[PDB]
Amino acid sequence: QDAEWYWGDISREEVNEKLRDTADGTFLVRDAGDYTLTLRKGGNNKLIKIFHRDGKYGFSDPLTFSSVVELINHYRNESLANPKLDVKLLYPVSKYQQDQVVKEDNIEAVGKKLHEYNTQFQEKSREYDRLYEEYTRTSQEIQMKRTAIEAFNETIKIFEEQCQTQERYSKEYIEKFKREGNEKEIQRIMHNYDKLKSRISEIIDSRRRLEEDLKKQAAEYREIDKRMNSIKPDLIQLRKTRDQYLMWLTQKGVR
C-alpha cells in the first residue's frame, strides 16, 4: 500500500515546490478513499483524480484496476496518449531522499541541531534584511545623484550661455569705451566676466566631485549586489534544512 511516490496528507503549497522547475514526467500521489495524482506537463502541475468504487480504481469510468499501485505501475511503462496528453509517469519524487537531511536518530539530538539551525537562520535573515536595506538606499542615492548630475549639466549650460551672451555684447561696447578713453568702465566689464568665469569653475568642480562620489557608490552597489546574490542560496538552503528538522519532530510525536 505504502510507496516512495505516495506521500499522504500534503498541502498544495508543498506539492508546487516539489514539481518546481522539473522535466515532463515528474509525479506524486496524495490523499484528497480517493487519491490525487499530480503529473508535470508543459511547465504545469496537472491534477488527475483516482476514483474509488467497490474496490476498483481509475482516472475515469470504466474502472479497470484493482489497486492504486497497479494504476501507477501500468502508466509508468505505457503512455497516457485517458486524456490527449503525450506524456508518461517517469520521475517519481521519493520520501527517503528527504530523510537523509535529518541524519540524527534520537529525538533529543534532532532538537539540539534544530536550535542551532534556527539560531543560524535568524542571524542570516537579519544580515540579509540589513543588506537589502543597504541595497535599497544605495540604489535610491545613486538615482538622486544621477538626477543631480543632469541638473548640473543644465546649470553649466545656462552659465556658459551667459558667457557667450556677455561676449556678444562686450565686443561692440569695448571699442566705444576704448575710443572714448574710459579705462575705469572697461575694467568693470572685464571683472564681471572673471567673476562669472570663476563661478563656472566652481560649478564644474562641484559636478566633478559628485561624479567621483557616483563612481564610488556604483562600485559599492556592485559589491552589495554581489553579496546579496551570494547570501540568497545559503539562506534558502539553511531555511529548507530547518523545515525538515521541524517536520521530523512533528512526525515523531503525538498526533
Binding site: 498544495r12 518546481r20 508543459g42 541638473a151 554581489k226 534558502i236
Partner: protein
C-alpha cells in the same frame, strides 16, 4: 527624472534666513543679490533691477515688468517661473541662481504643463523625449476619453458641474436591512435643518419628522410645509412656493463639503445610513444654489501641443507561418556576481500567458560570469499559430552554486519580460536590447511572470540582446472575423436537454473559490459542456482556466462564447482582471460588465485593487484604463483617490512611465481640481522635508529641543501659507483651515510620527467636528494598513447588509509616497495600556473606566457597542491573520467602540521566519475584555452576554465564508503591488485555511470554535442546529 527629495536646495534641507542668489541678467551681467528665504519673486525682481543700475551696460536692460525668472529645478528642468507670487524656498531650486529672460511661447500652456508636472512629481517635457511609438500614441489617443467626459460636465450646466465636484455619496442599493428599518420610528426619520438666516446671519434650527425614502427635493418640500403651518397658506399657494425653494436651494451635510444633488432616497446616503445605525439625529443645511454655483468655475480643456503636431512616422497573418517558435539569446553586458562563490550563469526563458506557462521552460547552455556569450536558438514546444494574443516571453540571468555537488542551488539575478505581440497586434521581429530589473525582495522563483513588461529606464543595468525570426513579412495577429470563421469549423467537425447530475456538478464547481483544485477530468467536463455554461454565467472564470490557451482551435471557440456571454456581477468581473486572465477579450468582457453594473460606491470601495490591476495589463492603451479615467473625470471623489493611488507609486521605476502618462491625462482634463491637488502636494512636500530634518540632522537631540525647532519652523509664513486652506487628502469632503500649532507634537510611536491639528473652517463645524487631527508618518510602508482597513470596511458592509450591527471602525489611511502616508485620528480614543495606567492595575480596570464615562441609561448602550465591535474584530483579525495584538495597539472610544490600530503585517507572514504551520488567533480575548462584555462577572463564559457574543462571531464568520470569492480576488489583484507579505498565490492560501473552504459549512463552524478554544483555553461550545446545514 523625478525630484530626489523635498529639500529646498541640493544637499541642503533648509536655506538659512538670508541666502546669496546668483542672478543672471539678459545683458550678460551677474549680480549676487542677498535674498531672504521666504521672499516672493516679485520682491526679488524689484530689488535685482535696483542693483542692476550699478553694474555695467544697464541701459540695454528693459522695464522689470517685461521679464520673468528661469532656473534649473531639482528635476533637471529649466522651469520658467510665470507665477511670481511664489516664495524662493518653495521653488525647488537645484542651486541658488535665477536667469532673467522675456516670456516666450504659449504662456497659458507652459503654466498648465508646470501645474500638471508639479502634481505628477516629474517634468511633462520628459514624455516628449520618449521615442517609443506606444507612449506617443497613448498620449494622443487617450485625449478622446478626456473630451468625452468634459463635454457631459458642461451639458446641463450649472447642475452637471456641481455633480462632478461634489458627487452624491450613496450606497449601492436603496433597500435597507432588517436591523436598520426597525430603528426608524415606523418608517420615519427625525432631522434638524440648520440654516444661516439673513439679515443677522444667525444659526437657526427646527425639528422635522419625515419619511426615510424621501428624495432631497421632497425633504425641502416638507421643511417649507411645516414652517408655513402657522401662516395658513392655501394648497396651491404652498405648492407654488415649494417649487421655488426646490429650484433655488439644496441640502448639505453640516461640517463638511458633502451635498445631496441627485434624486436618491434620503436613507441611501452614507451620512444618513450611518446616523440611523449610530442612533444620531442628522444635521443638514439648506445652502442657496447661487452661492454654490458662483464658487464653482467653468473647467476648460485646451487640446495639448503634442496633439496638434504633425505625425513623425507585405502583411502576413500568424496562422500562415508553418514553423515552430524559436528565440535567440545573444549576449549580456555585465552581471554582478562573485567569481569565487558563483560557478556559472545562464538565461532561463519561458513563454507565459499571465501565470500559467504555455510550454516547458527552455534554458541556454551554461557559460562563465566573465564571458556572458550564448548566441543560441532556443526551440520551444509550441506551434506559432497556437500562440494566443496575450503571449509573453519571460527571461532572467540565473546563477548556479555547485559547491555541495549533490545539490546545485539556482538563484535569479536580474529579470525582464517582453510582450511577444506589440500594441498594434504585430509579432516582434529582428534584434532587441532589453535592460533588466533587480529581483524583487523575497522572490525565490527563477522567473517573474507577474512583473511588468518592457525595458528598464535606468540604462546602468544588465542589457541582454535578442534576435527574433523574420519571415520576409510583417506578421500580424488575425482579425476577429478571421477568428470567428475558424471557430465555426472546429464546432462543425465535432457535430437539447442535459442530465441533472451534470447540472448539479456544474453548479458545485461555480460556487468553489478561485484557488480551488480544478481536476483534469473536471477541465474536460467543463470544456465539453462549454455551450451549456450560458445558463449559469458565474462559471466563466472556471471554464477559462480549462481552455488550452496553447491551441488556436480552443482559443477561437472561447472567443465566440465570450462575445455572446450573459452579464455577470461586478464582484465576479474583478476576478477576470487579475494576473491569471490576460486575454484582451476576457478583460474587455470584464470591463464591459463594470461599465453597466459597477456603481460609484463599489468603484470607490475597490479602487485600490483596480489601480494595481493596470500593472498586469500588457499595453498602455486598453479598455480598463479608459473606463477608470472616464469615471475619475466624471466623479471628483473617485478622481481624488485615483490621483493619490497613482502618485504614491511614482517613485517605483517599474510603473513610473505607465502611471506618469495616466496622471498627465487626468490632470489635463480634471480642471479646477488640479489647483486644489497642487495645494495638497505642496503641503505634503513640506511635511516630508520637515520630518527628514528630525531624522537625519536632529537625530541625536532631546524632545524639548526638537519641539522648539518644530514650532519655530511651522510659525514661518512659507509653512503657514502652504498648510492652511487646503482639502484633506484622506477625505476630499473634509477641509483643513488654520493650524492649531499648540496641539501639534512629535509622537513617541515608531519612526517618530508627527501629530497635526487643523481648525475645521466650515461655517457649521460645531455640529460634526471642530478639530481635524491627522497623524503624518514617514518611515514605515502603510500599503498593508490601507489594504487591511479597506478589507475591514468590506467585511463590515457585508455584515450590515445581512442584518448584523457589528460596528467596525475602518479609519482613513492613505499612502502618498515611498513609505510616506497619512492616518486619520479617531476622536476620544485611548489604548488599553493608557486606560490601565490611569487606574498598578486590575482586570476590571477597563470595565471601571467604561462605567465612569458611561453612567445611567448610556451604560447598556456602551456594553452592547463594545460586544458588537469586539465580535467583528475577533473574526476579522483571525481570518486575515494580522500581527499579534497587545495592549498598545487595541483602542477603545469613550462610548465603548473597540478597534485595532497599526496592523503592519497580514497572512502567515511569520511562517517563513519561524517555520510553524498554525492559524493563529491574533486578538486573544483576555479576562479584561470578557469582564466588560459580561457586565462584571466571575464566571464570564457562563453568561447570556457571552452566548450572544458567540452567536455574533459565528454569524460573521459564515458571512465572510459565503463571500470568500470576493476576498480571495481582492488579494489576488494586489500581487503585482510589490508588497513583501503578498507576492505568490501560496500567501493567499492562508485565508483558505482560516475560512475552511475545502471542508463543509458544519466543519467550518466546528473548526472556528476549536481555534477559539485552543487560544482562550475553553469557553466556546457547539450547537445542535449546526448538523442541519446543506453540506
Amino acid at each position: 527624472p523625478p525630484r530626489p527629495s523635498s529639500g529646498e536646495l541640493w544637499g541642503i534641507h533648509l536655506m538659512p534666513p538670508r541666502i546669496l542668489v546668483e542672478c543672471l541678467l539678459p545683458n550678460g551681467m551677474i549680480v549676487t543679490l542677498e535674498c531672504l528665504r521666504e521672499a516672493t519673486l516679485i520682491t526679488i525682481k524689484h530689488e535685482l533691477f535696483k542693483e542692476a543700475r550699478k553694474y555695467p551696460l544697464h541701459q540695454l536692460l528693459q522695464d522689470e515688468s517685461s521679464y520673468i525668472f528661469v532656473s534649473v529645478t531639482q528635476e533637471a528642468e529649466r522651469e520658467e517661473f510665470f507665477d511670481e507670487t511664489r516664495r524662493l524656498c518653495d521653488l525647488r531650486l537645484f542651486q541658488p541662481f535665477l536667469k532673467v529672460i522675456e516670456p516666450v511661447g504659449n504662456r497659458e500652456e507652459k503654466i498648465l504643463n508646470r501645474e500638471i508636472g508639479f502634481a505628477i512629481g516629474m517634468p511633462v517635457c520628459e514624455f516628449d523625449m520618449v521615442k517609443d511609438p506606444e507612449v506617443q500614441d497613448f498620449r494622443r489617443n487617450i485625449l478622446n476619453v478626456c473630451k468625452e467626459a468634459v463635454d457631459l460636465r458642461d451639458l446641463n450646466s450649472p447642475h452637471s458641474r456641481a455633480m462632478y465636484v461634489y458627487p452624491p455619496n450613496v450606497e449601492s442599493s436603496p433597500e435597507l436591512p432588517k436591523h436598520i428599518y426597525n430603528k426608524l420610528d415606523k418608517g420615519q426619520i427625525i432631522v434638524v435643518i440648520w440654516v444661516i438666516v439673513s439679515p443677522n446671519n444667525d444659526k437657526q434650527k427646527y425639528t422635522l419628522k419625515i419619511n426615510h425614502d424621501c428624495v432631497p427635493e421632497q425633504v425641502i418640500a416638507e421643511a417649507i410645509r411645516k414652517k408655513t403651518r402657522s401662516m395658513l397658506l392655501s394648497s396651491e399657494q404652498l405648492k407654488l412656493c415649494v417649487l421655488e425653494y426646490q429650484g433655488k436651494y439644496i441640502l448639505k451635510v453640516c461640517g463638511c463639503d458633502e451635498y445631496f444633488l441627485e434624486k436618491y432616497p434620503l436613507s441611501q446616503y452614507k451620512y444618513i445610513r450611518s446616523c440611523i445605525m449610530l442612533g444620531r439625529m442628522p444635521n443638514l443645511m439648506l445652502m442657496a444654489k447661487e452661492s454654490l454655483y458662483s464658487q464653482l468655475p467653468m473647467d476648460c480643456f485646451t487640446m495639448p501641443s503634442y496633439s496638434r503636431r504633425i505625425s513623425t512616422a507585405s502583411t502576413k497573418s500568424l496562422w500562415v507561418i508553418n514553423s515552430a517558435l524559436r528565440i535567440k539569446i545573444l549576449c549580456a553586458t555585465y552581471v554582478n556576481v562573485n567569481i569565487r562563490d558563483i560557478d556559472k550563469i545562464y538565461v532561463r526563458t519561458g513563454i507565459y500567458h499571465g501565470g500559467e506557462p504555455l510550454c516547458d521552460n527552455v534554458n541556454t547552455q551554461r557559460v562563465p560570469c566573465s564571458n556572458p556569450r550564448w548566441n543560441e536558438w532556443l526551440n520551444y514546444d509550441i506551434y506559432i499559430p497556437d500562440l494566443p494574443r496575450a503571449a509573453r516571453l519571460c527571461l532572467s540571468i540565473c546563477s548556479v552554486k555547485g559547491r555541495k555537488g549533490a545539490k546545485e542551488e539556482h538563484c535569479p539575478l536580474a529579470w525582464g519580460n517582453i510582450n511577444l505581440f506589440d500594441y498594434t497586434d504585430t509579432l516582434v521581429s529582428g534584434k532587441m536590447a532589453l535592460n533588466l530589473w533587480p529581483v524583487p525582495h523575497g522572490l525565490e522563483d527563477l522567473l517573474n511572470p507577474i512583473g511588468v513588461t518592457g525595458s528598464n529606464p535606468n540604462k546602468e543595468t544588465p542589457c541582454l540582446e535578442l534576435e527574433f525570426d523574420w519571415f520576409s513579412s510583417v506578421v500580424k495577429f488575425p482579425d476577429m472575423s478571421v477568428i470567428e470563421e475558424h471557430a465555426n469549423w472546429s464546432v462543425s467537425r465535432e457535430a437539447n436537454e442535459l442530465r441533472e447530475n451534470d447540472k448539479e456538478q456544474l453548479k458545485a464547481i461555480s460556487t468553489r473559490d478561485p484557488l480551488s483544485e480544478i481536476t483534469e477530468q473536471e477541465k474536460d467536463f467543463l470544456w465539453s459542456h462549454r455551450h451549456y455554461c450560458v445558463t449559469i454565467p458565474e462559471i466563466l472564470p472556471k471554464l477559462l482556466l480549462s481552455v488550452k490557451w496553447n491551441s488556436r482551435d480552443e482559443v477561437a471557440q472561447m472567443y465566440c462564447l465570450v462575445k455572446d456571454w450573459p452579464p455577470i456581477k461586478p464582484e465576479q468581473a474583478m476576478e477576470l482582471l487579475d494576473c491569471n486572465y490576460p486575454d484582451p477579450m476576457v478583460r474587455g468582457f470584464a470591463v464591459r460588465c463594470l461599465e453597466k453594473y459597477l456603481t460609484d460606491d463599489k468603484l470607490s470601495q475597490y479602487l485600490i485593487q483596480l489601480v494595481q490591476v493596470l500593472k498586469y495589463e500588457q499595453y498602455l492603451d486598453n479598455l480598463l484604463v479608459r473606463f477608470l479615467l472616464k469615471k475619475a473625470l466624471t466623479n471628483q471623489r473617485i478622481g481624488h483617490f485615483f490621483f493619490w493611488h497613482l502618485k504614491s507609486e511614482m517613485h517605483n521605476k517599474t510603473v513610473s512611465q505607465r502611471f506618469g502618462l495616466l496622471l498627465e491625462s487626468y490632470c489635463r482634463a480634471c480642471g479646477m481640481y488640479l489647483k486644489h491637488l497642487n495645494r495638497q502636494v505642496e503641503a505634503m512636500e513640506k511635511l516630508i522635508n520637515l520630518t527628514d530634518i528630525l531624522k537625519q540632522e536632529k537625530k541625536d537631540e532631546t524632545q524639548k529641543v526638537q519641539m522648539k525647532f518644530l514650532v519655530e519652523q511651522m510659525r514661518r509664513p512659507d509653512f503657514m501659507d502652504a498648510l492652511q486652506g487646503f482639502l484633506s487628502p484622506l477625505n476630499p469632503a473634509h477641509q483643513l483651515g488654520n493650524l492649531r500649532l499648540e496641539e501639534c507634537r512629535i509622537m513617541s510611536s515608531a519612526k517618530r510620527p508627527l501629530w497635526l491639528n487643523w481648525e475645521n473652517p466650515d461655517i457649521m463645524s460645531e455640529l460634526l467636528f471642530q478639530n481635524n487631527e491627522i497623524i503624518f508618518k514617514n518611515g514605515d510602508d502603510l500599503r498593508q494598513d490601507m489594504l487591511t482597513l479597506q478589507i475591514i470596511r468590506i467585511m463590515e458592509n457585508i455584515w450590515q447588509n445581512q442584518g448584523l450591527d457589528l460596528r467596525m471602525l475602518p479609519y482613513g489611511c492613505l499612502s502618498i509616497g515611498d513609505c510616506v502616508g497619512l492616518i486619520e485620528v479617531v476622536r476620544n480614543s485611548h489604548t488599553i495600556m493608557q486606560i490601565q495606567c490611569k487606574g498598578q492595575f486590575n482586570s476590571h480596570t477597563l470595565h471601571q473606566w467604561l462605567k465612569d464615562k458611561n453612567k445611567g441609561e448610556i451604560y447598556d448602550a456602551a456594553i452592547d457597542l463594545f460586544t458588537r465591535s469586539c465580535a467583528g474584530y475577533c473574526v476579522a483579525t483571525f481570518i486575515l491573520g494580522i500581527g499579534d495584538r497587545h495592549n498598545s495597539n487595541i483602542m477603545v472610544k469613550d462610548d465603548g467602540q473597540l478597534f485595532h490600530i497599526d496592523f503592519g503585517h497580514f497572512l502567515d507572514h511569520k511562517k517563513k521566519k519561524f517555520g510553524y504551520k498554525r492559524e493563529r488567533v491574533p486578538f486573544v480575548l483576555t479576562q479584561d475584555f470578557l469582564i466588560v462584555i459580561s457586565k462584571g462577572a466571575q464566571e464570564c463564559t457562563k453568561t447570556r452576554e457571552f452566548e450572544r457574543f458567540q452567536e455574533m462571531c459565528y454569524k460573521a464568520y459564515l458571512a465572510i465564508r459565503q463571500h470568500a470569492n470576493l476576498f480571495i480576488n481582492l488579494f489576488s489583484m494586489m500581487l503585482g503591488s510589490g508588497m513583501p507579505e503578498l507576492q505568490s498565490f501560496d500567501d493567499i492560501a492562508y485565508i483558505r485555511k482560516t475560512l475552511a473552504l475545502d471542508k463543509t459549512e458544519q466543519e467550518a463552524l466546528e473548526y472556528f470554535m476549536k481555534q477559539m478554544n485552543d487560544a482562550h483555553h475553553g469557553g466556546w461550545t457547539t450547537k445542535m442546529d449546526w448538523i442541519f446545514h446543506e453540506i
